[PDB]
From a paper:
To gain molecular insight, we focused on the subset where Pex5 and the Eci1–Pex5 interface was most stable, containing only a single Eci1 subunit bound to Pex5. The maps from this subset were refined to 2.7 Å (1 Å=0.1 nm) globally, whereas Pex5 and the interface were resolved to 2.9 Å after local refinement of this region. Interestingly, there was electron density for an additional 21 residues at the Pex5 N-terminal region (276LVNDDLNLGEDYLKYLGGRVN296), which we name the Eci1-binding interface (EBI). This interface had not been observed previously in any other known Pex5 structures. Cryo-EM maps of the Pex5–Eci1 complex, containing the full-length Pex5, did not show electron density for the N-terminal domain (NTD) of Pex5 (up to residue E275). The first involves the C-terminal segment (268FRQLGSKQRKHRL280) of one out of the six Eci1 subunits, which includes the PTS1 (278HRL280) and interacted with the TPR3, TPR6 and TPR7 domains of Pex5. The PTS1-containing segment was located within a deep central cavity of the TPR domain and was reinforced by a network of hydrogen bonds formed between 278HRL280 and residues in TPR3, TPR6 and TPR7 of Pex5. Our structural analysis revealed a previously unidentified binding interface – the EBI, consisting of an elongated stretch of 21 mostly variable residues in the NTD of Pex5 (276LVNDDLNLGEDYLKYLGGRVN296). This stretch interacted with a distinct interface on Eci1, as well as with a few residues from the C-segment of Eci1 (F268, L271, and G272), suggesting that the EBI and the PTS1-binding regions work together to facilitate the interaction between Pex5 and Eci1.
Author numbering:
A (entry chain A): 4 to 79, 85 to 280
B (entry chain G): 276 to 423, 433 to 559, 575 to 612
The structure:
């Protein structure tokens, strides 16, 4: 049995394993253990012999605002800074990214709003992507925080968006807006709904999916994915291992945490 | 004309600002003679009303909220006194507790949005003002909000509050206040000044509005009018430490240094009344005129009348 999370739930409907991020008031920001819980949920979908599709849905106006940096500038159990950051960043990132890389069921993502950070990195590893309207974007803010690529974006961002686009958006910290997503065929359908109701959007996506899978041999879908994955599996594994160990030096240096401290240090001069 | 909150990136930072520090728990006091006075809440209320010291009212509410941690009004009044006592973290903590018990309190939402603005968490203040609106005028706000890449959060909520202000047949204040706060965070202080001066003509017997006028002015480099509004606020309430601190800051800004050291001694003496917060500003005002005799005597365990002379009251 898998434990319970007040921020991520799931269910099984026919051949669909549906994952739901249900913390809309913090913009679905996830901590380390929430990323490890996603990894576990994907490992749980991967072993059900009745599941063929794995569907990741969200709630609110954001898909996910990224990692949870709440309480990171607080000053207040590790013998060094390297050991601390190994345990608190490298393990989580390597684990959840590899869980997404090797998934054997078809991964579908329903974008109800923007995605940021490691969550956008995980969006760009899903196989099919649906958007609610044309106000969605992906933001990888690594140069502003003092970090480098995460979640296999080294391989997936140039693969799905282009090399020149990726350079212009990552070197200068810009978003992958919706028209860039539509020029590269990133989004498979735009449901064009009001951005206020993500529940109706999620329900509509599931209904349309149920219509599409009528009459197909589904083992065939799983075999075709097994073969289509073998194109870039080695690139992704190599990038995973290299990224999580190259970003450790940026954490240990001390720039990300310094920038975090001077982010939340804007007290005003006079009062009221 | 709005895309989302966080405005197509470029507001991701400034959304992390309101989160990285976390939440601090309320830091109680060790010598609180009201630890078991079953009238401690009553005593706190009567201290708040009778113009007594604010530190003592704060202690009484400490007791009342350590006797029954569900008395929402006790948390509310503790936050109210702690923010006018110039303790923003204790005030924010108390008001957060109150709002978490009573998620539809109005004055808690308002005072907490003002404190957030003071600390620089502008987006949390925006959400709190949105929530105050939709819990105060739910139907009007609900049909305002359903009308649905150029506009950011501040402008969006300013337009919403403007339209809310027009869709009612009065000019009832506490809506002009929030308009002033939105403009204030935008850094166009003259709209804020107009709003606060208008909210005072409808009730010029306020102290918080005079202090907010003082702050809005002093941000715009009108230090003389700032001094005058602080003096007004203090005339209406001599226990108001927020106003003394602001007064001293702007005095230091305009070369008045003996008065400012007197004001900081007075603030450190209004905090230290049980039988404290930033001292660095006192060090700065002493380094301005450079008197080593008092410069080198910095201590959170010292005397204040020991600072006789020019520093003396």
């Amino acid at each position: 049995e898998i434990r319970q999370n007040e921020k991520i739930s799931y269910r099984i409907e026919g051949p669909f394993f549906i994952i739901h991020l249900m913390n809309p008031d913090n913009l679905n920001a996830l901590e380390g253990e929430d990323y490890i819980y996603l990894g576990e949920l994907l490992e749980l979908a991967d072993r059900n012999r009745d599941v063929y599709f794995t569907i990741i849905q969200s709630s609110g106006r954001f898909f996910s605002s990224g990692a949870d940096f709440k309480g990171i500038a607080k000053a207040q159990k590790y013998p060094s800074e390297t050991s601390k950051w190994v345990s608190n960043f490298v393990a989580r990132n390597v684990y959840v990214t590899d869980a997404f890389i090797k998934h054997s069921k078809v991964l579908i993502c329903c974008l109800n709003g923007p995605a940021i950070g490691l969550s956008a990195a995980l969006v760009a590893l899903c196989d099919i992507v649906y958007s609610i309207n044309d106000k969605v974007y992906l933001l990888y803010p690594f140069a502003n925080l003092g970090l480098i690529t995460e979640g296999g974006t080294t391989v997936s961002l140039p693969l799905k968006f282009g090399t020149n686009t990726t350079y212009e958006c990552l070197m200068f910290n810009k978003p992958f807006k919706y028209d860039i997503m539509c020029e590269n065929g990133f989004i498979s359908k735009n449901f064009n709904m009001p951005s206020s109701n993500a529940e109706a959007f999620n329900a509509k996506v599931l209904e349309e999916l149920r219509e599409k899978v009528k009459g197909l041999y589904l083992p065939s879908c799983l075999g075709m994915k097994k073969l289509l994955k073998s194109n870039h599996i080695d690139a992704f594994n190599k990038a995973n291992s290299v990224e999580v160990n190259e970003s450790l030096k940026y954490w240990v240096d001390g720039e990300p945490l310094k920038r975090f401290r001077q982010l939340g240090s804007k007290q005003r001069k006079h009062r009221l | 004309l709005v895309n989302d909150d966080l405005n197509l990136g470029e507001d991701y930072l400034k959304y992390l600002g309101g989160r990285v520090n976390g939440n601090i728990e309320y830091a109680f006091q060790s010598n609180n003679e009201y630890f078991n006075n079953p009238n401690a809440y009553k005593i706190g209320c009567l201290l708040m009303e009778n113009g007594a010291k604010l530190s003592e009212a704060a202690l009484a509410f400490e007791a009342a909220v350590k006797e029954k941690p569900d008395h929402v009004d006790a948390w509310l009044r503790l936050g109210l006194v702690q923010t006018q006592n110039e303790k923003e973290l204790n005030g924010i903590s108390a008001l957060e507790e109150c709002l978490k018990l009573d998620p539809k309190n109005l004055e808690a939402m308002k005072t907490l949005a003002i404190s957030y603005i003071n600390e620089g968490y502008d987006m949390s203040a925006f959400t709190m003002l949105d929530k105050w609106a939709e819990t105060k005028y739910p139907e009007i706000w609900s049909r305002i909000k359903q009308q649905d890449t150029h506009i950011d959060m501040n402008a969006h909520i300013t337009k919403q509050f403007l339209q809310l202000a027009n869709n009612l047949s009065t000019i009832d204040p506490e809506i002009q206040l929030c308009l002033g706060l939105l403009f204030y965070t935008k850094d166009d202080f003259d709209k804020t000044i107009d709003c606060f001066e208008s909210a005072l003509r409808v009730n010029p017997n306020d102290e918080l509005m005079w202090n907010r006028l003082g702050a809005s002015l002093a941000n715009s480099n009108r230090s003389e009018e700032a001094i005058q509004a602080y003096h007004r606020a203090l005339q209406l309430k001599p226990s108001f430490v927020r106003a003394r601190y602001n007064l001293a800051v702007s005095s230091m800004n305009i070369g008045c240094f003996k008065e400012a050291a007197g004001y900081l001694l007075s603030v450190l003496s209004m905090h230290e009344v049980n039988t404290d917060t930033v001292i660095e500003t006192l060090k700065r005002v002493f380094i301005a005129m450079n008197r080593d005799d008092l410069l080198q005597e910095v201590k959170p365990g010292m005397d204040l009348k020991r600072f006789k002379g020019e520093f003396s009251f």
